Coordinates of N, CA, C and O and ligand atoms in Angstrom, one line a residue:
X160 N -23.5 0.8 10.3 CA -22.8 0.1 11.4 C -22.3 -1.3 10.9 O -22.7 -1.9 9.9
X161 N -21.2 -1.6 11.7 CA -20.8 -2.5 10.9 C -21.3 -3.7 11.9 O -21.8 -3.5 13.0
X162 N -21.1 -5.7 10.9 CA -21.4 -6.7 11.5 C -20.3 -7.0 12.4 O -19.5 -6.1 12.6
X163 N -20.2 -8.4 12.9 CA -19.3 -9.2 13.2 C -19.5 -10.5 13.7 O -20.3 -10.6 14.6
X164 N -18.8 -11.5 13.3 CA -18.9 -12.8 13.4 C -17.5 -13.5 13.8 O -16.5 -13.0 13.5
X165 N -17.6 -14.3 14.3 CA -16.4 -14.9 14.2 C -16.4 -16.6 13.7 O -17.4 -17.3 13.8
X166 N -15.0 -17.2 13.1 CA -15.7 -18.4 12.3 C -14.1 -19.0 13.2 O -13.6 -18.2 14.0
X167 N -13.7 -20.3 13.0 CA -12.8 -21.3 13.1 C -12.6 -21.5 12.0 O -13.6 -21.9 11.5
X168 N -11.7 -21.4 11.3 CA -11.2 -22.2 9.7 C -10.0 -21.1 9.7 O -9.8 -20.1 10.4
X169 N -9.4 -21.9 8.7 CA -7.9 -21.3 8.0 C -8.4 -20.2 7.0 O -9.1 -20.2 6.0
X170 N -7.8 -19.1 7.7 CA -8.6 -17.6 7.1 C -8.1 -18.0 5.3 O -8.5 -17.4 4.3
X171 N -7.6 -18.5 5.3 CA -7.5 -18.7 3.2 C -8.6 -19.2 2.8 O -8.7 -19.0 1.6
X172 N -9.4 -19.6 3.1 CA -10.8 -20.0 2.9 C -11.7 -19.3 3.0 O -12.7 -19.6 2.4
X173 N -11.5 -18.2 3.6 CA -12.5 -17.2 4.0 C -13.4 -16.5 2.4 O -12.8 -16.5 1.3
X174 N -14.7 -16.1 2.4 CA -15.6 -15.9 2.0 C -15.8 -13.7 2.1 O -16.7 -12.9 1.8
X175 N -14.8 -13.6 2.7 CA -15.1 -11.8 2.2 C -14.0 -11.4 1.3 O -13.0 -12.1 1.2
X176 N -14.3 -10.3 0.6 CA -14.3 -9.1 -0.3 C -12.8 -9.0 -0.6 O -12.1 -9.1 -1.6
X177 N -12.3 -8.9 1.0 CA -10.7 -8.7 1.5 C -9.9 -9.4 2.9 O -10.6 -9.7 3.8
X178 N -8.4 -9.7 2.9 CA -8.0 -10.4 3.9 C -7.5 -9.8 4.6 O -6.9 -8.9 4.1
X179 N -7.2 -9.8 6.3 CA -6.2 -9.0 6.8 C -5.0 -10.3 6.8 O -5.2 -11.3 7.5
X180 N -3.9 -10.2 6.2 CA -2.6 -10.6 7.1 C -1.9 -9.9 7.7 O -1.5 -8.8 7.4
X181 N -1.6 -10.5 8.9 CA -0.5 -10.3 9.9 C 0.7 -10.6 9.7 O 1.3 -11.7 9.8
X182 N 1.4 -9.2 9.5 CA 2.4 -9.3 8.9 C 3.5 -9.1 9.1 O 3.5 -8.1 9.9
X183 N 4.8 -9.4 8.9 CA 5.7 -8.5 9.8 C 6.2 -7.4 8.5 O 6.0 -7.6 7.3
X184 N 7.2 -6.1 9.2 CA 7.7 -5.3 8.5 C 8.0 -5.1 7.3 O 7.7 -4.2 6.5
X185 N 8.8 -6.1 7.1 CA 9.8 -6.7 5.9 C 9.1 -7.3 4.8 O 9.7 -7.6 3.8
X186 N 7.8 -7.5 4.9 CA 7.4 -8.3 4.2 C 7.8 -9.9 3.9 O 7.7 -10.4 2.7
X187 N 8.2 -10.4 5.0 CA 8.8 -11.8 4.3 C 7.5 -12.7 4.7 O 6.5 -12.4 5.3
X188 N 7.9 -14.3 4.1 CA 6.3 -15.2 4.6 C 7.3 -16.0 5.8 O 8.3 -16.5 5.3
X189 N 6.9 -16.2 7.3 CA 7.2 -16.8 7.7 C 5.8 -17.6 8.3 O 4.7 -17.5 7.7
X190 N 6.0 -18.8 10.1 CA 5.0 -19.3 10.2 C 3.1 -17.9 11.0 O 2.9 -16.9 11.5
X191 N 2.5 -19.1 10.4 CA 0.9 -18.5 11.0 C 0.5 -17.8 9.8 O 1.0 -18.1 8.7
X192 N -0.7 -16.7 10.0 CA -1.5 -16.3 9.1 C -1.1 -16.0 7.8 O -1.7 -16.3 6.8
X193 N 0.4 -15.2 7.9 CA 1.1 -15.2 6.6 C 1.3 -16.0 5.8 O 1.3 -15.7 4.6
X194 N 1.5 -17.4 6.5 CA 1.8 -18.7 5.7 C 1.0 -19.2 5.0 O 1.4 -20.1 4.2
X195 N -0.6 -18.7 5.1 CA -1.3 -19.4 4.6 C -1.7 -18.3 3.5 O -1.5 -18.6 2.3
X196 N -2.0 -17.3 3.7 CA -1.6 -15.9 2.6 C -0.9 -16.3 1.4 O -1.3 -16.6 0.3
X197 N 0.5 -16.2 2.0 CA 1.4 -16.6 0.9 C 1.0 -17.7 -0.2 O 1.2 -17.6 -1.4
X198 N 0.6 -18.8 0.2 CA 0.7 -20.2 -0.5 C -1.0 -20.2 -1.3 O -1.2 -20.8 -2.3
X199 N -2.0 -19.4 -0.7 CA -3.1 -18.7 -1.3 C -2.6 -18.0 -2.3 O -2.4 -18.6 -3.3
X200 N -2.5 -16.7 -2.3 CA -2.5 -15.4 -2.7 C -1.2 -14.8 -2.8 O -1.0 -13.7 -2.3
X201 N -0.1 -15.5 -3.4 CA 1.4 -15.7 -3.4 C 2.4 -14.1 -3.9 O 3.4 -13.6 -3.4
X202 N 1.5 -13.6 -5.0 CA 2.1 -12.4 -5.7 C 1.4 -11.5 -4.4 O 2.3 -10.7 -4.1
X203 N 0.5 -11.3 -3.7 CA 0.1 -10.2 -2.7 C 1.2 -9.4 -1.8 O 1.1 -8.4 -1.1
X204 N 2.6 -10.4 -2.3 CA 3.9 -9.8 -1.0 C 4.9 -9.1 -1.6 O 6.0 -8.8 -1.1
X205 N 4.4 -8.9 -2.8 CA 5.3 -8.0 -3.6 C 5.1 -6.7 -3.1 O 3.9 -6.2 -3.0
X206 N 6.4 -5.9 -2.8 CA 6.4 -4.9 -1.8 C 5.3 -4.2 -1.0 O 4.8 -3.1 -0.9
X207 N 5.3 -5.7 -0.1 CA 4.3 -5.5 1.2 C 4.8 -5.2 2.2 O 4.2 -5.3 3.3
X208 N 6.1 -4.7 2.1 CA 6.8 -4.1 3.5 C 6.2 -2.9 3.9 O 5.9 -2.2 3.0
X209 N 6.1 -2.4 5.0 CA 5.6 -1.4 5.6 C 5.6 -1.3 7.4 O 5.7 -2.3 8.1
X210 N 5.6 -0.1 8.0 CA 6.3 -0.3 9.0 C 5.3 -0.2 10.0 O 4.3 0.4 9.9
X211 N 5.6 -1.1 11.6 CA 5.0 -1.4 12.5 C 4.0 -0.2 12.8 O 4.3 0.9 12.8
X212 N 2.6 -0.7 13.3 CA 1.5 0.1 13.3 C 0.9 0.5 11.7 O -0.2 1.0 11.6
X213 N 1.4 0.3 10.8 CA 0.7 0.8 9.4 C -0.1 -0.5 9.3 O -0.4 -1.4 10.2
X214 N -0.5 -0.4 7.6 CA -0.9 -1.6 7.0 C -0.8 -1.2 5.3 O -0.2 -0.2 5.1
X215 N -1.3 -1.9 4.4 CA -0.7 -1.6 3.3 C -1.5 -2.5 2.9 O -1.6 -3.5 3.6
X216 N -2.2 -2.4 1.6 CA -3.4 -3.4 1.1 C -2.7 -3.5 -0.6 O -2.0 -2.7 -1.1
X217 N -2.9 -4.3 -1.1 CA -2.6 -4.7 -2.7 C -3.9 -5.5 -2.9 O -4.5 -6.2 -2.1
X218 N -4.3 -5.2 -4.4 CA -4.8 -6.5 -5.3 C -4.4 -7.3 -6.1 O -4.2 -6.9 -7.2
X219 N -4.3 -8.4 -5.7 CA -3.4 -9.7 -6.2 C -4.2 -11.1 -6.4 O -5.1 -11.5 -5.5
X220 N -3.9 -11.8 -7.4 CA -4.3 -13.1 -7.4 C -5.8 -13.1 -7.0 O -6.2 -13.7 -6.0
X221 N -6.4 -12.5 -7.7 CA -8.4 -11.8 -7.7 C -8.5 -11.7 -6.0 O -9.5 -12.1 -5.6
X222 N -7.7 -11.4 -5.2 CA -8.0 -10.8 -3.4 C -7.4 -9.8 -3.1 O -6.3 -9.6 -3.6
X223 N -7.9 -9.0 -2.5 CA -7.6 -8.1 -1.9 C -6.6 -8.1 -0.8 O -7.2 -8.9 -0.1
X224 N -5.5 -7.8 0.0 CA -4.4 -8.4 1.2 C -4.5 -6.5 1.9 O -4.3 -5.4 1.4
X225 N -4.9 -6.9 3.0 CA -4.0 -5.9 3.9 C -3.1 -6.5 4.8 O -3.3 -7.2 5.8
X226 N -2.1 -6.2 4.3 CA -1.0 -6.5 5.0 C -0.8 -5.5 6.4 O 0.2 -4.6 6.4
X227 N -1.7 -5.6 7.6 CA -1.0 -5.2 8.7 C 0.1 -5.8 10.1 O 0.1 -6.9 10.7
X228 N 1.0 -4.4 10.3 CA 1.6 -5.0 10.7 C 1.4 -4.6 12.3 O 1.8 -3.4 12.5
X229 N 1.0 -5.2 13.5 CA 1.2 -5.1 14.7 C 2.4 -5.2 15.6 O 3.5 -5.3 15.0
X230 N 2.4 -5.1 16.2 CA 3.9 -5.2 17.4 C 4.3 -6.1 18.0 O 3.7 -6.8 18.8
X231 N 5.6 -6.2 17.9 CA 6.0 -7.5 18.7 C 6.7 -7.1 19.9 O 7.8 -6.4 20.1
X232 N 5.5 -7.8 21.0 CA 5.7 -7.1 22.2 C 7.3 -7.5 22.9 O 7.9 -6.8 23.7
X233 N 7.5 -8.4 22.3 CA 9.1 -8.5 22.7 C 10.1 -7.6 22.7 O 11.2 -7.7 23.2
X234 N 9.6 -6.6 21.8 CA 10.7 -5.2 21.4 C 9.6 -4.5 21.6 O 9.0 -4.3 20.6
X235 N 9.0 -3.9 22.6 CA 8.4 -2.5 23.0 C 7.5 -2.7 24.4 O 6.9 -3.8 24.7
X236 N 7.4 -1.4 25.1 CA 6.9 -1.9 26.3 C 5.6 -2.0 26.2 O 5.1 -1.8 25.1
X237 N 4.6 -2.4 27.3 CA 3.6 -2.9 26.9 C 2.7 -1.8 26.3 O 2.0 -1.8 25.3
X238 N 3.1 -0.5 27.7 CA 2.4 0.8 26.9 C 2.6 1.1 25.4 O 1.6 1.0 24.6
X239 N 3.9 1.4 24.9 CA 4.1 1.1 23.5 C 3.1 0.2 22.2 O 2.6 0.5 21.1
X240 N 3.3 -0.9 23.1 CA 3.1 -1.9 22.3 C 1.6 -1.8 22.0 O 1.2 -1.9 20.9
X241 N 0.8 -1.5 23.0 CA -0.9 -1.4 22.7 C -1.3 -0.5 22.0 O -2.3 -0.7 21.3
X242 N -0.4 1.2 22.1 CA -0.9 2.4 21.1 C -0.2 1.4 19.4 O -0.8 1.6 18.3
X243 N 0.7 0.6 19.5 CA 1.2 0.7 17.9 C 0.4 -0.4 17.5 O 0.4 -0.7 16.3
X244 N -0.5 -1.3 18.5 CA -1.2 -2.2 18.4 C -2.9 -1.4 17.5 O -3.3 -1.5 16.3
X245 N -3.4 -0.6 18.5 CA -4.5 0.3 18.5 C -4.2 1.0 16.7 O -5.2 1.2 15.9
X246 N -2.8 1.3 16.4 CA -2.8 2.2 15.5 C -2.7 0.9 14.1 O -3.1 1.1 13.0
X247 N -2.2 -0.2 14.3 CA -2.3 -0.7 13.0 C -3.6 -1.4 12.3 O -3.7 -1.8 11.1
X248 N -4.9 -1.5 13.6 CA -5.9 -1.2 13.4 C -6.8 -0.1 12.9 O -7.8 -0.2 12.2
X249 N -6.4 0.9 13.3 CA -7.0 2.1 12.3 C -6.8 2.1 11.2 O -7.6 2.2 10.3
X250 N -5.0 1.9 11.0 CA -4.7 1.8 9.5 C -5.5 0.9 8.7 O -5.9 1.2 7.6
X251 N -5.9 -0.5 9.4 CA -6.8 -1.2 8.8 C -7.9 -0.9 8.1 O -8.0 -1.0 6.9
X252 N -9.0 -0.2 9.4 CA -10.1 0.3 9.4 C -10.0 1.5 8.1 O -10.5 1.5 7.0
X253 N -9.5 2.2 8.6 CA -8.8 3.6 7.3 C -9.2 3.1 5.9 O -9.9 3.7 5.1
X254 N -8.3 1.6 5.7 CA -8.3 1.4 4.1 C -9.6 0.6 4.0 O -10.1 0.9 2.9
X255 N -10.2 -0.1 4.5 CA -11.3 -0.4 4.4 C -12.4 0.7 3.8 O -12.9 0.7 2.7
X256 N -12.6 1.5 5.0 CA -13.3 2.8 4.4 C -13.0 3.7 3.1 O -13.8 4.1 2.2
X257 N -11.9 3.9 3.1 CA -11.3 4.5 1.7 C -11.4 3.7 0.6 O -11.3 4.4 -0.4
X258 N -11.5 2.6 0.4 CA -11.7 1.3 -0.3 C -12.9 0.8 -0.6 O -12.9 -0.1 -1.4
X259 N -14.1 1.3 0.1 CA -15.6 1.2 0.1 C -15.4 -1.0 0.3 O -15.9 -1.9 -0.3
X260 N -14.7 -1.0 1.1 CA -14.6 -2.9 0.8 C -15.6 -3.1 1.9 O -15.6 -2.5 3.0
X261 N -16.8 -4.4 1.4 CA -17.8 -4.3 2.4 C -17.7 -5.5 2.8 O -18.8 -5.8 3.2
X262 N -16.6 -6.5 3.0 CA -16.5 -7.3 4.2 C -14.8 -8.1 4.3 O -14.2 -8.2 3.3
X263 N -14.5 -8.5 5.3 CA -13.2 -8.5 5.5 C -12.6 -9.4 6.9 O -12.8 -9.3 8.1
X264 N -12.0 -10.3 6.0 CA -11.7 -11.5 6.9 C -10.7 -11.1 8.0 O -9.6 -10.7 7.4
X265 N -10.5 -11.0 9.4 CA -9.4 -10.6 10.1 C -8.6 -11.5 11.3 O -9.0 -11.6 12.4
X266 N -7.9 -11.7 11.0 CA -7.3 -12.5 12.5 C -6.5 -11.3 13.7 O -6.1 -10.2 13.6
X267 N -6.5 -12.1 14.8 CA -6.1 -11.1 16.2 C -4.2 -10.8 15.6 O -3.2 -11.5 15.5
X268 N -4.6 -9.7 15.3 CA -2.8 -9.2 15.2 C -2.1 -9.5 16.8 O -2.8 -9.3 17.8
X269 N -1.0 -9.8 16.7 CA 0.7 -9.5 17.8 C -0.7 -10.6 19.1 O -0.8 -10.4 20.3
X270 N -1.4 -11.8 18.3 CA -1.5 -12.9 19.6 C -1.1 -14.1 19.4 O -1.7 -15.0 20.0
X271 N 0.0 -14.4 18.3 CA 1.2 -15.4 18.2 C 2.3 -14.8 18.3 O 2.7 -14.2 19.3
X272 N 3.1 -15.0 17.1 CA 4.6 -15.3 17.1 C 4.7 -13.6 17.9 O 5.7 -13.5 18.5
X273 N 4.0 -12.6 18.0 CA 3.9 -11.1 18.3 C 3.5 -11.2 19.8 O 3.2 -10.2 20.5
X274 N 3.5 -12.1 20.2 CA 2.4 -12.2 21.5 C 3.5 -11.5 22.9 O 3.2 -10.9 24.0
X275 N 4.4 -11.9 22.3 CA 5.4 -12.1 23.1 C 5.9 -13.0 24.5 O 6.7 -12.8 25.4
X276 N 4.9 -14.2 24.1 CA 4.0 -14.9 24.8 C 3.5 -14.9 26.0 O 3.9 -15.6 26.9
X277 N 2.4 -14.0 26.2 CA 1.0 -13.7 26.6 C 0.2 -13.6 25.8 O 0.4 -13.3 24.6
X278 N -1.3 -13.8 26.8 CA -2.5 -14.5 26.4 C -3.2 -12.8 25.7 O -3.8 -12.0 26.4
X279 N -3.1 -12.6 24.3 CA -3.9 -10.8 24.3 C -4.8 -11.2 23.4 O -4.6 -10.8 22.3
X280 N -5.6 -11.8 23.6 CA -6.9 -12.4 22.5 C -7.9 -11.3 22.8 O -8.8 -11.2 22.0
X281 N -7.9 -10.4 24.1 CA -9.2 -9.8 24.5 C -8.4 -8.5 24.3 O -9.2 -7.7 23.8
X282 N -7.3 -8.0 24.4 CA -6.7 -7.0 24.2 C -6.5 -6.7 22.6 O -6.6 -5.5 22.3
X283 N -6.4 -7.4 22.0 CA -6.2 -7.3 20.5 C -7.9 -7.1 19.5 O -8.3 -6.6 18.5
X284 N -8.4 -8.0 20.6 CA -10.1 -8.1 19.8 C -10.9 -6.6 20.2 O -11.8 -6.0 19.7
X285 N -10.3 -6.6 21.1 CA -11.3 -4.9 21.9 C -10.1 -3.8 21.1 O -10.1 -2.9 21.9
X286 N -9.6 -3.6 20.4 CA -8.7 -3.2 19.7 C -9.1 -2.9 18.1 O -8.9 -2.0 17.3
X287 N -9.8 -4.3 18.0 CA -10.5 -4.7 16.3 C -11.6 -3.8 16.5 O -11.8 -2.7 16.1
X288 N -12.3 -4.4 17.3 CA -13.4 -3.7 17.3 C -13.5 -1.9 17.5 O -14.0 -1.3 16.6
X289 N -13.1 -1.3 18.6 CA -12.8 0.0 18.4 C -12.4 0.6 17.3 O -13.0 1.7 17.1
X290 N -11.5 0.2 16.3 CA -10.7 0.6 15.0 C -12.0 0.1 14.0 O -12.2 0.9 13.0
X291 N -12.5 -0.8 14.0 CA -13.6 -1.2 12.7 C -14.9 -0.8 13.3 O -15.8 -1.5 12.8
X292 N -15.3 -0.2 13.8 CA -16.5 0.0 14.9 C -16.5 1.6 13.7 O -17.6 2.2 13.7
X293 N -15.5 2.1 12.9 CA -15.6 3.9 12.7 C -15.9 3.1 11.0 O -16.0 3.9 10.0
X294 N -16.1 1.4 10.7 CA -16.5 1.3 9.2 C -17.4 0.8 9.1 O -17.9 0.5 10.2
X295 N -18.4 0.2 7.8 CA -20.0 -0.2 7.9 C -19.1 -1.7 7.1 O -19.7 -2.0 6.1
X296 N -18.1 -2.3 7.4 CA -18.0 -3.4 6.5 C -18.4 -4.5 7.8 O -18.5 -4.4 9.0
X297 N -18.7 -5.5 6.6 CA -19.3 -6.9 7.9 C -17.5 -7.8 8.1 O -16.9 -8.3 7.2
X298 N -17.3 -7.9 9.1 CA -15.9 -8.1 10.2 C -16.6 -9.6 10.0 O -17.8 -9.8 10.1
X299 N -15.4 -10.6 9.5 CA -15.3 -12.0 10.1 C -13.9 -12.2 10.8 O -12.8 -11.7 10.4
X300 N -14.0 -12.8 11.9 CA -12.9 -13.0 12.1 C -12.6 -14.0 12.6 O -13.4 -14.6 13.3
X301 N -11.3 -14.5 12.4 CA -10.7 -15.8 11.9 C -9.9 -16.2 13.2 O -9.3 -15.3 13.8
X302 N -9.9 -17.1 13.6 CA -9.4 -18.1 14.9 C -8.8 -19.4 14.6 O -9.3 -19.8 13.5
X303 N -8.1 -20.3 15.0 CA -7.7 -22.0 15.1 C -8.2 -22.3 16.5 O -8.1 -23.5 16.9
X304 N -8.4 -21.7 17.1 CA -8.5 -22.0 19.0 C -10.1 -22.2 19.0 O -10.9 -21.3 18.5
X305 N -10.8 -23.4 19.7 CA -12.4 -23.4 19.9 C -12.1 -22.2 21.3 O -13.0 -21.4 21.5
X306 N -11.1 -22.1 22.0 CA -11.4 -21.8 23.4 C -11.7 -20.1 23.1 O -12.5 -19.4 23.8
X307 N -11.0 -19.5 21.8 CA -10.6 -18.3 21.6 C -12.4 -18.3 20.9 O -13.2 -17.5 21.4
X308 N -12.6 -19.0 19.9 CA -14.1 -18.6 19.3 C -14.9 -18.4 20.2 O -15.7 -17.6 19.9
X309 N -14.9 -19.0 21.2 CA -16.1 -19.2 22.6 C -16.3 -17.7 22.4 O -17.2 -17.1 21.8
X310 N -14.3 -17.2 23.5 CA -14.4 -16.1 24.1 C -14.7 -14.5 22.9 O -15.1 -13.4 23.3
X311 N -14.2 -15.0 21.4 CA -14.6 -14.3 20.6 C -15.8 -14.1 20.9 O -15.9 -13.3 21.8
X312 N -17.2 -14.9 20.3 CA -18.2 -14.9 20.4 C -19.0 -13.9 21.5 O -19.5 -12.9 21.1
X313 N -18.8 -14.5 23.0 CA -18.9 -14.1 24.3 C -18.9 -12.1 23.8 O -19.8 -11.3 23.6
X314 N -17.8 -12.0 23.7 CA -17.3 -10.7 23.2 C -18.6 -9.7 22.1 O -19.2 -8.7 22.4
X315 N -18.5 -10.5 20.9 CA -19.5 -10.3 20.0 C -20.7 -9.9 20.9 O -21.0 -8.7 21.1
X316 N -21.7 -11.1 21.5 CA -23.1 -10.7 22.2 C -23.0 -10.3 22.8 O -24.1 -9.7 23.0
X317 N -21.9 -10.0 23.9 CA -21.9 -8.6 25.0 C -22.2 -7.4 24.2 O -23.0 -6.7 24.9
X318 N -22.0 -7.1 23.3 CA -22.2 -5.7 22.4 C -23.7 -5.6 21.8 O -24.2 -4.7 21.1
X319 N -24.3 -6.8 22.3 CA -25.8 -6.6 22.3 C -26.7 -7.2 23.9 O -27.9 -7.2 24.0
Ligands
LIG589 N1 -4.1 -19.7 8.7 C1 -4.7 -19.1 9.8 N2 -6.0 -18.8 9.8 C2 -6.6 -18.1 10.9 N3 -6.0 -17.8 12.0 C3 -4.7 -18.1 12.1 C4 -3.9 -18.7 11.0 N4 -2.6 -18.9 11.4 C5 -2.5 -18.3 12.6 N5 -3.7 -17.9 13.1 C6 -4.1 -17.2 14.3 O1 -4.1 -15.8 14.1 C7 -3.4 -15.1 15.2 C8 -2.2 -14.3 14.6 O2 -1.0 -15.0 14.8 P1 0.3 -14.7 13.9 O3 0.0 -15.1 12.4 O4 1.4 -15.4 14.7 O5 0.3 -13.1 13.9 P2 1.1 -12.1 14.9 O6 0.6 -10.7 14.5 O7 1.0 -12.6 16.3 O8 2.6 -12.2 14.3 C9 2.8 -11.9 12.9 C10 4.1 -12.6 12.6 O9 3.8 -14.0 12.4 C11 4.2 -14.4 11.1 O10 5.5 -15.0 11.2 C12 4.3 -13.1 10.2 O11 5.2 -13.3 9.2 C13 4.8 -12.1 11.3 O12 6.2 -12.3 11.4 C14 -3.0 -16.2 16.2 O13 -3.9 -16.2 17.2 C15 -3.2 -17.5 15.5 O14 -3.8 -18.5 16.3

């Protein structure tokens, strides 16, 4: 079974195995989690393009990157948007397991620049967890919001 925690800090700091960035398609670095990826772990974006709902992991610069890519709800409906949301989480999950990687830093995919602006911190987190719930790796996951760690948290001890 797997852990989970959630921390506040700039996921480039993070202390597991492997990173998830949030990514878009194309692989380019623009602003949020990518940005800090990039300027960390700079070579990880060499052909990290891959298409909405996948993910795509490299080893670079001694870390591991999965580069997943979630949905920008701005181009798909919301139905849409939560199955390709749901699915770039498995992909996640997927390479984790195939990769025996036993812990892994994650931020909420498509709840910024993807957000399409709405609030999906509980929709994206109940999403993480379903999709990493099928691996035994210990889940940190990564926030800037105290209000979002709360409701992280909250989230976490309901499940006990
Ligand atoms: N350094 C960081 N550390 C931890 N959490 C972060 C960081 N930066 C942002 N967050 C939080 O992590 C969450 C994810 O926000 P986003 O990075 O927008 O991901 P998306 O999937 O919505 O959009 C990805 C696109 O954004 C980029 O342009 C990529 O190039 C893509 O084009 C938010 O709640 C942030 O508060």
């Amino acid at each position: 079974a797997p852990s989970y925690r959630v921390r506040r800090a700039d996921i480039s700091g993070h202390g597991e195995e492997a990173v998830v960035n949030a990514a878009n398609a194309k692989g380019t670095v623009s602003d949020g989690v990518c940005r800090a990826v990039a300027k960390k772990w700079p070579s990880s974006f060499k052909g990290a393009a891959t298409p909405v709902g996948t993910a795509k992991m490299i080893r670079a610069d001694g870390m591991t990157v999965i580069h997943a890519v979630g949905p920008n709800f701005s181009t798909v409906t919301e139905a849409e948007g939560d199955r390709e949301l749901a699915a770039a989480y498995r992909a996640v999950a997927s390479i984790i397991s195939t990769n025996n990687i036993k812990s892994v830093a994650v931020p909420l995919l498509s709840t910024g620049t993807f957000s399409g602006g709405k609030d999906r911190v509980m929709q994206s987190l109940n999403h993480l967890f379903t999709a990493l719930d099928a691996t035994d790796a210990d889940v940190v996951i990564y926030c800037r919001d105290k209000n979002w760690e709360k409701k992280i948290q909250e989230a976490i001890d309901r499940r006990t």
